[PDB]
Structure formats: structure tokens, C-alpha cells
Ligand binder design. Sequence first.
Ligand code: NA
Length: 630
Amino acid sequence: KKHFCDIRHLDDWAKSQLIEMLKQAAALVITVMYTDGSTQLGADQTPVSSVRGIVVLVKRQACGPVLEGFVSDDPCIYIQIEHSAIWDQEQEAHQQFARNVLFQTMKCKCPVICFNAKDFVRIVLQFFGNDGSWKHVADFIGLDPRIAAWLIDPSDATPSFEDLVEKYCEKSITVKVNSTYGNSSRNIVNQNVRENLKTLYRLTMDLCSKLKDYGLWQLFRTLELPLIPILAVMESHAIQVNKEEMEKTSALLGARLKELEQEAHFVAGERFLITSNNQLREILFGKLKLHLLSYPSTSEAVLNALRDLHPLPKIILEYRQVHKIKSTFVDGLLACMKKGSISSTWNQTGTVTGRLSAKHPNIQGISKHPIQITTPKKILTISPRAMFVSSKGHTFLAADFSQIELRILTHLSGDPELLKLDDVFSTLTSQWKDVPVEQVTHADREQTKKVVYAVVYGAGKERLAACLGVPIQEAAQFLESFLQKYKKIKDFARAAIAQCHQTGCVVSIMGRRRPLPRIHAHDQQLRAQAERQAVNFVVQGSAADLCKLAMIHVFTAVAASHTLTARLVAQIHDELLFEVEDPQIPECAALVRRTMESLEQVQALELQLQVPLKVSLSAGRSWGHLVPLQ
DNA sequence: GATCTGACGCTACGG
DNA sequence: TCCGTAGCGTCA
Ligand code: NA
């Protein structure tokens, strides 16, 4: 009542006093209110309602009394996001003060606690619009209890606010987050908002304490938190795509699939659903009985084993390829389009490895290598990544770590041969093809690197022999070859497993952890699975750590530069994709390289490697075609 | 009739 | 019985 104020209705002296209160506050506690009015504190991840406003709890304490007189203590202030029916001058004014207040929220020196901070920052950024850039939110730090709880239990599904309260809050704290207009009144909604913001503060503090207990605090602060505005910035931008080229390509791939469907129906001597794996399985081994010649799955390995036995596996393979490209990287990419561009949604809570994930579309899952088709009424090369074009004038600058996890593995194992080892998988592919590097095909590399991946993480002789098309004897032989050549990899794995048995958990370089209780399981498949998972997590988690660190450091570096406008557009694990203004390319590519390479040594945390990190830079007007640089 | 959904298989991405 | 993301399609 005196605890809730619309900042538009404040007298100007009270407005000034409010700005000063925000500057001198002990902590800010924030949630987004929708038109329901519901909050991020309620249970839905998707409101399916518009954003109305933002509520901020201003805490004076985390000494003496206080009388402001225009508000009580501690006050909740409300900031209208939603546009009114008519735009006019008073709306302009309201917007001016609102932007001032929200920016105060962004730059304030006290702790900011927001349940989902990325959403908040995105909303604020889009609210700034023209009077602000992405560099305004760059330094924003805010305490996201969901991220903390994720660091503690990465496996657990993304919990609601109430879940987090019952789990991490002691004790007997019951919240009502479910109030809306129409199931309740405004006063109920608001009272509950204030109470739940207090509770949110308490919860977040408790979770911070826990994070310190588990040794996750420094990781939380240095790595996860500064990443929050970076995701929001990426979600605030959009990558322009070819609506037109894409519709064409769609039509073409549709024609070709019609062809392939007809062919398959022909050669199987029946009309079966071309997209059905069940029916294909029944045909391939149901009738044809190919396994007996020399049931199994329809998977690419099996289908490649049978490629000479019958014309159907090859047909099916090509069909699956073309159908995937069209259905997913064309048609499904056309449905993600707004205004001739797309924007992915980023999830920091998505993985157990500490990796980022992306949705609608998944831009981390876009096929790297273009595919070839025979046009039905010349050869036709189709690259989905070629559909992603930079704005004009602007150009994409890509920067990736070369063989990041191999180098991580070198660091962790300390294998002398590796530590010795101008290329990597061209070397091994050359050694396997019994020829130099220069004539080695990219597909040979594609298979080989995947095979070293298989063997290092504990793959058996079976799956090994399968993926490279090897008889078991060459399987065990190749296993022993690689593991005896580099001894310290098995030692490292054996150590990681031992650690996971000891602690009941396994830990990455920067302290990110993967609890694996089934390491203690009696079931042997479960136990072995937990072991594989631990061994993989040390490396993949460490690399996730490093990639996030690079992301943050480059973002920060560009953030304070007066010249450089470079915007981080996408991240694909090992790779950072920037949209840079043309004349800024040389100066930007320089800053990017120097920054990412300096990652070899950063204090804190001790964070030192045994191997330099080679950064590969690329540039181009399209994501599909990027010419190497420098 | 036209949908909803949980589970599985296969395909891409990335190491 | 390499790991683990998303996405699309069949099936009961
Ligand atoms: Na007014």
C-alpha cells in the first residue's frame, strides 16, 4: 500500500529521492510481472502473457532509522514495460524516467537478485531500445538462484521458485506465487509479490551460502553470472536469413525426396512408409534378410554395412540426409523466422556438462558440411549455414579453439607424446591412410577424430569396430595401438574414475562438478556408465569452462572499447560467431585473438594450462562461407 | 473424424 | 556399454 508505488505517479522530488535510494541501497530484489498479473516466481516457464512491468524491492539493509515520507521501508517500486494504446509525450516522459531507473538497476553497486536474470536483462535491453546499446548491460551482475541450484544439482530438471524454496529454504516458509487478476485481486497479487521478493532474497542468500560450501562460489561469480547479460544480448539480436532461397531449396529437396521415395518403394517391392524405421526394419531383415547374408537397427552404421547387399540401404541413407536438411535446416528454419531473421533462445541451465544449449532454432545443431543433390526437373551444392548472412555493411568473424578437448586431455593426462604434438587429425589420418596429409579427405578426418573420441572416453571394441567398419580383430588391435602409444590417457581415466568413487562426484578444471551416485551402484552397466560419464565430464566440462571464460573475456574486452562495435551473435561450443562492422574487422580480429589466446594463463583461478591454445579466425559475409584470416 | 503425448530411433551439432 | 545437446518423425 505504502510498500508499492508506480514510479510514474511519484512527485519529482520523490523521483530524485528514489534514484538516490537505488544508488545507496543494500540490495535490489527484482521480478517481472506479466499481464496476469503473474510473475517469474509463479509456476510456468512460459507465461503466454505479455510483460506488463518490473517490480523492484529496495532494501536499505542486508544502520539507524529512516523516514523518506514518500515511501515506506522497504519499498517495492513498479516500472511499466507494456505500451499504452496511444503514444504521446507523457508516454515519452514516463519512458525517460523508467529508462533512467532501470539503468540505475543495471549499474548499481549493490547485489541484484532476480529469479531469471536473462529474461529480465533482455526485457530491459529491448526497453532501452535506441537510447541504449548492449554495452550498457555488459557489467550487470545479478544473483540467479536457479543458476546456483543448477550448479549444485545440474541433473535436476529446471525447478520453479516454490520448488527451490521448499528445497533450499529453512524452514517452514510457504509462499503463494499463484495469484492472478481474476483468481484474486490486485492487492493480493502485489502483497504476495512483496512477500515473495523478500523470500526470494532469503533463498538466494542461502543458495550462495551452499555454493560456498560446495566450492562452487568462485565458478558462480567469475563464470556463470557475467554470462547472463551475454545470452540476453544474443537473444536481443537477430540473424538475417534467405526466406527466398530457402523456399526454393525446400521445393527442390521436396522433389528429390519424392524421387527417392519412389525408388525405395520400387527396390523394396512394396509400398511402405519411407519415414518409418519400423517398416524399413521389417523389410530389411523381415523380408530381405540381409543380416543373414553377412534384428539389427536401421542406424547408419548397419545401413553402411549393407550398402553392397542391396540398393535400399543407400537409397534410405540419401533420403534421410536430404529429408533432414530440408525438414530441419530449411522448413523448420522458415518457421522460426520473424521479419526475415531468426533468433535462438539460450539456456544456461540446460546441461549437466556446463555447456550452453539453444532452441528455436538450435543454432548449435546447424549442419556444418553442405550436401550434394542431383537436380530433378547439373550438380547442386546446398549449405544451410550459407543461409545465414551478415547485415550490410557488416561481416561475420568466427573464432574457434582448435582441438580444444584434445589439448585439455593433454593437460590433464600429461601424456608426453601428445604434449610434444602444424596440424593434428591430418597427422593421424595420414598415418592411418598410409600417405601424407595433403591428400587426406575431410571425411577421413571426420571418421578418425570421431574414432579417437570413441577410444579415449572408454568405448569398447564393438562400437569401435562398427564406427570405422572394422573386424573385431582390428578393433582390439587399434585399441591396444592407441592406448599403448599414449599411456597416460588410461591413467587419467583411471584416476577420474577413482576420484568419482571416492567423492561420489567428479570435478572439472574451474570447479564445476558432476555428482554421479550410480558410481556406487551394484548394477554393473550403471556403474560402468557412471565411470564413462565421469571421465567424459572432466574433459568436456573443462572445455565448457574454458569456452565460457573466452566468451566472457572477449565480450568484456569489446564492452570497454570506444571504437569497437563487434557484437557476439552466436556460440557453438568451441566457436564464437561475431557480427562486426567491416572497417573494424582487423582491429576486432586482433583483439579477439589476443584475448582468447591469453586464456592459457588467467589468475584467478590458478587456471594455468600445459599447452598453448591455438585460435582459428575466419571472416565472411555468410556463415556458410568464411575465408580463413591471418 | 482430428488431435495430444510419452517413448523410442535416427540425424544433425559439438568434443 | 564413448559423452550429451536439440529436432523431427512413427508408434501405441
Ligand atoms: Na499519467
